């Protein structure tokens, strides 16, 4: 009984669709618990300068009373069921979702449907959520990871909606009107751009029925996404008073749909992630990590491949001592260079295995799986079987990693963001000369 | 698709479950938590947690790290006050390789002088990072205030010992506490015959082996955080007593934390109790810790520094209400549904299930299916809950706080 074989046995994801266009997707198991939610192709990317932050403002109001369950009635019913109600906003996606007992699924689905559609948005509650967001913005300003990444986007996609923060500028939070939240919801929360997803002990049939019963009033009658122009650029907030420097660096990536994301994630896994609690240290597999541990070049770093429609951020973020920024950047670029030109078979096998494990072990329990269903239908227009993922990973070899990495990294212009005591952060020109090798 | 469980003659429990999933996950659980340190080897189990990739008899420090990473692996070590747990995850085809590693690290570490010496500063790093979360301050002090002996020990080495844990001490700790008698070998995604086999040969460690005495105390930490954390607990009940289930339900009556993002917590006694008067940033939750031979029950506040008097009192009062009768069945139903739901959810994953099955294997000696657990939760009487609340109010108090404690009361100020 092998891994290969196990992949075949993984439960089927099922998808159906209402006349208003809303999709319904589910994975079935023999659990007593489930997770169910609405995923929506809406977010900051669909916002203009004028309405930026609306998606976020709505998320504060999402659970504060419907017309059917006014005031705190919404949360009362959820608490007493023992069920768990959560939400999130990306640049491209919005989700609301409930974790509950399989037995309460019908009631859960009712609650979701009530939240998205009959959300009451009371003038006085809006005034409350106004100051809350303002203060959340204050707190955010003291998260350097948050700030640098926001900046990465701000410069990487300058002059577009991709440049915009999810939370919105403080101006907008102060001014955003009840009417404006109305416009936004009316414009974006439309059935062909929404998915009802769920996993656990449930019958696909039954979910679909419940969908039909609660959601069918939802309009499906077009905000589509302009390409977003990427720009080689640098944003540097020098603030010597902070105790560590954050740097995020990224090249233009391919976007959700492209098959290169597989080979790219293999490569990213080779290079890896590191944190000064990581036990591995000098003996670590990644040269970046062993060298960064050995020489105390940084506290931490991660590779990332951030995916959007038809674009993305492919790179790395590190946090490090005020004096290691250059050394860090040098080793990191050296890694990208090595993979582009000279990646070994063995290390690619390793990268494969990392990504294999990552995909299997991530999809564990009802919530991660419910999300995978939901987002997948928004991004790939379907759920991708584990066994398919595996055969695309198996395809990747030395040559493929080299070839793909070259496409995106080798002699391309990165976008750069640093915050903090970044006095030593390499000049942009030096960074750009680090994206090729004279020897190759 | 059923949990298989066996106990060897020599006491070692084995639990497995062939779920034929693509990923396999093995835990070796050990009665070897911080409680088993004495005043002479404080911090040793901390170092031992940090030390899992030091050279073993069977594989070099290099081989552990490279070998596990080769196949997309994960090797990981968890401690509570009572247990330690060595977990390996991988793709199912390679459990052979990871079992080899797990057995090496737990069965024959060498703890070479130079490696141990070298790992010492990690103690400070891991500790320093941990103490960033101020909950850890309060909770570790709390245990120290509450007990005089084992459960008193913090999970993170005390400063005076960083640099000073020895090879010999690491050896003693392993030789004395990693014995067949005090281990549970849990296995999701592997065949139970093969776990038996492995454990029979490789976990045959000859059995090389005080009640925790709650006294009650108070520990204050002055800084200037301007938010004050405080926990107030009384002795509770040990795991496996039906009293234990009573406390758990009382916890969920009073409210143990939020069910809704940005939630008002309409249903949390404690939260609404505080909030009827104090209208600014705060948080409050029932605290419940149940151990082999004791338990702590109470609440934890996070308040403004100036408000801590007002918040801690408001919170304590709410428990007095329950203790003096005021508890509807609506409330206790809500509580049980929460606990029931939250239990089942906590075993939704591979992670959570493994931890539960291994946890129980040590603590009882058996598996309790979720259905039976829910029965035991249903089986608690509102009278039992009122009793548990009664027990807290009347019981001798332990307290720990940290922050600007200017307006934070001492125990004896109620």
């Amino acid at each position: 009984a092998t891994y290969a074989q196990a992949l075949q046995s993984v439960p089927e994801t099922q998808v159906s669709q209402l006349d208003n266009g809303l999709r319904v997707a589910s994975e079935q198991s023999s659990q007593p618990t489930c997770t169910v939610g609405v995923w929506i192709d809406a977010g900051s990317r669909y916002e203009s300068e004028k309405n930026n932050g609306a998606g976020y403002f709505v998320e504060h109001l999402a659970f504060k009373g419907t017309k059917n369950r006014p005031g705190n009635a919404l949360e009362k019913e959820v608490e007493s069921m023992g069920a768990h109600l959560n939400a999130y906003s990306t640049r491209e996606h919005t989700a609301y979702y409930i974790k509950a007992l399989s037995k309460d699924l019908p009631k859960a689905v009712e609650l979701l449907a009530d939240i998205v559609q009959n959300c009451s948005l009371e003038d006085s509650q809006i005034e409350k959520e106004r100051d809350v967001i303002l203060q959340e913005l204050q707190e955010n300003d003291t998260s350097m990871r948050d700030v640098v990444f926001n900046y990465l986007h701000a410069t990487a996609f300058q002059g577009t909606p991709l440049a915009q923060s999810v939370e919105g500028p403080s101006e907008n939070v102060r001014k955003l009107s009840r009417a404006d939240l109305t416009e936004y919801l009316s414009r974006h929360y439309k059935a062909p751009r929404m998915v009802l997803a769920a996993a656990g002990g449930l019958e696909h049939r039954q979910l679909l029925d419940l969908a039909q019963k609660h959601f069918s009033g939802l309009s499906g009658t077009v905000p589509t996404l302009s390409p977003c122009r990427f720009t080689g650029s640098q944003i540097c907030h020098r603030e010597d008073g902070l105790p560590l420097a954050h740097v995020a660096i990224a090249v233009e990536g391919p976007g959700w749909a492209h098959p290169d994301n597989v080979a790219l994630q293999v490569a990213n896994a080779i290079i890896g992630h590191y944190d000064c609690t990581y036990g591995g240290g000098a003996h670590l597999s990644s040269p970046l990590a062993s060298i960064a541990a050995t020489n105390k070049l940084c506290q931490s770093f991660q590779t990332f491949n951030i995916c959007y429609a038809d674009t993305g951020l492919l790179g790395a973020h590190f946090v490090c001592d005020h004096m290691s920024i250059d050394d860090m950047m040098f080793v990191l670029q050296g890694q990208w260079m090595r993979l582009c030109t000279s990646a070994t078979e063995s290390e690619v096998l390793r990268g494969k295995n990392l990504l294999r494990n990552a995909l299997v072990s991530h999809l564990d329990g009802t919530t991660p799986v419910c999300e995978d269903i939901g987002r997948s239908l928004l991004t790939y227009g379907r759920r991708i079987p584990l066994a398919e993922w595996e055969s695309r990973i198996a395809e990747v070899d030395a040559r493929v990693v080299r070839e793909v990495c070259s496409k995106y990294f080798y002699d391309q212009c990165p976008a750069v963001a640093g915050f903090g005591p970044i006095e030593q952060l390499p000049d942009y020109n030096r960074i750009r000369s680090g994206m090729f090798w004279l020897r190759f | 698709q059923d949990l298989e469980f066996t106990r060897l003659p020599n006491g070692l429990v084995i639990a497995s479950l062939e779920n034929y999933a693509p990923a396999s996950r093995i835990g070796l659980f050990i009665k070897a938590g911080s409680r088993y340190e004495n005043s002479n080897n404080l911090g040793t189990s901390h170092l031992l947690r940090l030390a899992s990739s030091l050279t073993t008899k069977g594989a070099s420090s290099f081989k552990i790290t490279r070998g596990i990473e080769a196949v997309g692996g994960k090797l990981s070590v968890t401690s509570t006050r009572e247990n330690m747990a060595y977990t390996v995850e991988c793709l199912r085809d390679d459990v052979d390789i990871l079992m080899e590693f797990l057995l090496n690290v737990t069965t024959a570490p060498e703890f070479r002088r130079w490696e141990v010496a070298a790992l010492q500063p990690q103690l400070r790093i891991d500790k320093a990072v941990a103490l960033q979360n101020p909950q850890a301050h309060v909770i570790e002090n709390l245990h120290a205030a509450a007990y005089r002996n084992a459960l008193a020990n913090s999970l993170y080495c005390p400063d005076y010992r960083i640099g000073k844990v020895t090879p010999v001490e690491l050896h003693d700790y392993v030789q004395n506490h990693f014995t067949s008698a005090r281990m549970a070998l849990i296995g999701l995604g592997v065949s139970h015959p093969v776990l038996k086999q492995v454990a029979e040969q490789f976990l045959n460690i000859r059995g090389g082996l005080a009640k925790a005495k709650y006294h009650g105390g108070e520990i204050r930490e002055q800084n200037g955080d301007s938010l004050v954390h405080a926990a107030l607990v009384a002795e509770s009940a040990a795991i496996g007593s039906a009293e234990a289930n009573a406390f758990s339900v009382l916890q969920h009556v009073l409210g143990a934390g939020p069910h809704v993002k940005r939630g008002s917590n309409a249903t949390s006694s404690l939260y609404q109790a505080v909030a009827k008067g104090v209208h600014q940033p705060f948080d409050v939750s029932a605290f419940n810790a149940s151990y082999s031979d004791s338990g702590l029950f109470g609440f934890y506040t996070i308040s403004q520094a100036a408000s801590a008097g007002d918040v801690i009192k408001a919170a304590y009062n709410q428990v007095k209400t329950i203790a003096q009768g005021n508890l509807s069945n609506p409330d206790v139903q809500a509580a049980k549904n929460k606990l029931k739901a939250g239990y089942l959810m906590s075993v939704e994953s591979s992670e959570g299930f493994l931890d539960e099955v291994g946890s129980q294997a040590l603590a009882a000696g058996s598996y309790t299916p979720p259905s039976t657990v829910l029965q035991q939760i249903d089986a608690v009487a509102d009278a039992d809950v009122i009793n548990a609340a009664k027990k807290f109010v009347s019981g001798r108090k332990s307290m720990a706080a940290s922050g600007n404690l200017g307006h934070t009361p001492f125990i004896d100020e109620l």
């Binding site: 609690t277 670590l284 | 990473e69 509570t80 006050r81 909950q135 934390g257 705060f282």
Partner: peptide, 27 residues
């Protein structure tokens, strides 16, 4: 932390569990 919203969920009710790893950050 500058708001009830963000502050809530901090009040502890888990007796602590320290977990450190090989290739996953400590918690």
């Amino acid at each position: 932390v500058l708001c009830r919203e963000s502050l809530r969920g901090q009040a502890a009710g888990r007796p602590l569990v320290a977990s450190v790893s090989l290739n996953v950050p400590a918690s």
